[PDB]
């Protein structure tokens, strides 16, 4: 009995009109915060039922929520799509009661229920950031000449491939390697979005700071096969990759 709905964003029309939704999607933390507030704590509704106070996340409750940023249902209208799921009841009249300019159509929600079998075909779209934890030589200053010390910095490098390998079967081999651990097996998958995803974060007289959030996103699509139905119920609403809370874990439950 999972909670699947649709938020609908314009991303089009007259360029002269300032569209706050367009800058709302052009950052991770904005959509993250707005969908995180979309499950408010119950005592706030009893206290302020009108969404008319300076909020605080300590008053809010915390759940491993997750979304999906897509676009382009055609038919002579370019439009952008937000697909959200989590485990608690969301509210959309509470969330966007002052943000009617954010959307291009009123949101809609129905009841959806997923079922899985053994050795059954599926169709899926996932998004996982290309993340490989590596020891790197540090490279700072860069004032005319390179300067390094013996310290090896620890971070997650974006995925790279050898010069005799195209990106396509490299990410196919990544998905093939990650399949038997998570609980499925595929025969082929198609790469259709490899790119860079940028964002920024504020944090606590104090100031505010801007740092470029960095994620090597990978959105794929097409034809899934399963090995056991019991290895998929714990995958939905939790995520399979990294940047889990940032909207990188929705299992597209479309059996066809």
């Amino acid at each position: 009995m999972i909670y699947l709905s649709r938020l609908l964003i314009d991303t089009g029309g007259n360029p002269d009109r300032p569209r706050p939704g367009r800058k709302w999607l052009d950052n991770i933390y904005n959509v993250h915060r707005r969908l995180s507030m979309a499950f408010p704590s119950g005592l706030r509704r009893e206290q302020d039922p009108h969404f008319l106070k300076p909020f605080s996340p300590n008053d809010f409750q915390k759940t491993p929520f997750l979304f999906r940023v897509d676009n382009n249902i055609d038919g002579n209208d370019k439009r952008a799509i937000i697909i959200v799921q989590s485990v608690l009841e969301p509210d959309w009249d509470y969330c966007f009661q002052n943000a009617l300019d954010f959307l291009a159509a009123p949101p809609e929600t129905k009841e959806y229920n997923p079922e899985f079998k053994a050795g059954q075909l599926l169709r899926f779209r996932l998004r996982v950031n290309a993340s490989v934890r590596r020891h790197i030589p540090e490279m700072v200053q860069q004032d005319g000449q390179t300067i390094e010390t013996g310290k090896i910095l620890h971070k997650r490098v974006s995925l790279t491939w050898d010069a005799s390998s195209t990106p396509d079967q490299a990410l196919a081999d990544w998905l093939a390697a990650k399949s038997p651990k998570l609980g499925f097996t595929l025969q082929r998958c198609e790469l259709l979005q490899l790119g860079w995803v940028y964002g920024s974060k504020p944090e606590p007289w104090r100031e505010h700071k801007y740092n470029p959030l960095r994620f090597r996103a990978a959105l794929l699509e097409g034809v899934l096969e399963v090995d056991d139905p019991k290895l998929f119920l714990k995958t939905l609403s939790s995520g399979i990759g990294k940047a889990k809370s940032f909207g990188f874990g929705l299992l597209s439950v479309l059996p066809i």
Partner: protein, 350 residues
């Protein structure tokens, strides 16, 4: 004269352009929505392809001081070059400048030579550097894509002057438009994807290419042949997927056959999308042949298909002079109409 190439190609949506939101680019043409490939996407995809890699004589750099520190070897010519570039006009926000410099791969050595020389002051160094990066034009990529380089004046010395830092383009590439209405993705609110039929229109001015290349002729012929080969043998980002049909004509005025697809080619059968589009093109071409092209200078054209699979003459109209089936033969057939221009002897020029 003006060379115009109209090609019909099949492009899968996994190998296309995107906007800031990850959406494939779309445009409203004829009142209906079409999939769009931007002109700059095709321009850079042709630029960075394997076929055009021998003529990639241009660079577009915000970090020119790094290119200064690539051949001298001595460590202490990076700050001097930075102050020289600041005195020329390009701001120093980071290690890169604030403006984009369109340069060629033979004056970088001269720039390093001027920077490492210590017999002159900063102002004369800036003047010599401006004389260097205002005539850095002898590059086929510079000739095709054009150039508009321009400095900042509030943070520039009053004595250093700038020459004509503007090279007008010779390549007019239209935005590629899907003939059909763009196929909607499977709405998930309930080998893999069919490739879209794209119409591409490239216009090259021979005269503008030869004054942009300072009168050098065989380099321009090699540029045109390599551009045609790269246009028919590329896929923007990622990745044979040959084009379905190429019409090359040579006239003195530009003409766009995009209005062939004002009416969408709405075909339910997926295999009939391509040849019907070719038929539609022929219809419009015939109209443009008759309603606009009479007397003065008749236009000749060459048609190409993969082993002559899809003809465009409607089996009786001779609107294309010859239908050939080899892409290299098409390059040879469009090279020798401009005069001589053997393709086998043109590759020995940069």
């Amino acid at each position: 004269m003006l060379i115009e190439i109209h090609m019909i190609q099949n492009h899968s949506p996994a190998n296309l352009n995107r906007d800031d939101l990850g959406a494939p680019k779309t445009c409203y043409f004829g009142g209906v929505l079409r999939s769009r490939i931007s002109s700059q996407c095709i321009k850079r995809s042709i630029r960075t392809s394997n076929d055009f890699k021998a003529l990639l004589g241009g660079v577009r750099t915000r970090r020119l001081a790094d290119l200064i520190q690539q051949e001298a070897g001595e460590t202490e010519c990076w700050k001097k070059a930075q102050e020289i570039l600041n005195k020329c006009g390009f701001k120093n926000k980071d290690d890169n400048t604030k403006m984009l410099v369109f340069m060629s791969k033979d004056k970088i050595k001269d720039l390093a030579r001027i920077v490492l020389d210590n017999s002159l002051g900063l102002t004369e160094a800036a003047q010599q550097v401006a004389n260097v990066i205002a005539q850095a034009t002898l590059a086929p990529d510079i000739a095709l894509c054009g150039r508009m380089l321009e400095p900042n004046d509030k943070d520039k010395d009053k004595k250093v002057k700038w020459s004509n830092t503007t090279v007008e383009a010779a390549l007019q590439v239209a935005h590629a438009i899907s003939t059909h209405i763009a196929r909607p993705e499977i709405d998930y609110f309930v080998s893999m994807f069919a490739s879209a039929c794209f119409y591409k229109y490239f216009s090259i001015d021979w005269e503008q290419l030869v004054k942009n290349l300072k009168g050098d002729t065989n380099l321009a012929a090699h540029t045109v042949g390599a551009f045609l080969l790269a246009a028919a043998k590329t896929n923007p980002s990622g990745k044979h997927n040959y084009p379905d049909g190429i019409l090359v004509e040579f006239k003195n005025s530009p003409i766009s056959y995009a209005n062939a697809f004002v009416r969408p080619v709405s075909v339910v059968k997926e295999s009939d999308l391509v040849e019907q589009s070719i038929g539609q093109l022929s219809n419009y071409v015939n109209d443009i042949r008759l309603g606009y092209y009479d007397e003065q200078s008749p236009v000749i054209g060459f048609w190409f298909s993969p082993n002559n699979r899809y003809p465009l003459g409607y089996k009786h109209s001779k609107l294309a002079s010859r239908n050939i089936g080899n892409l290299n033969e098409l390059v040879g057939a469009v090279l020798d109409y401009i005069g001589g221009f053997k393709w086998e002897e043109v590759q020995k020029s940069k």
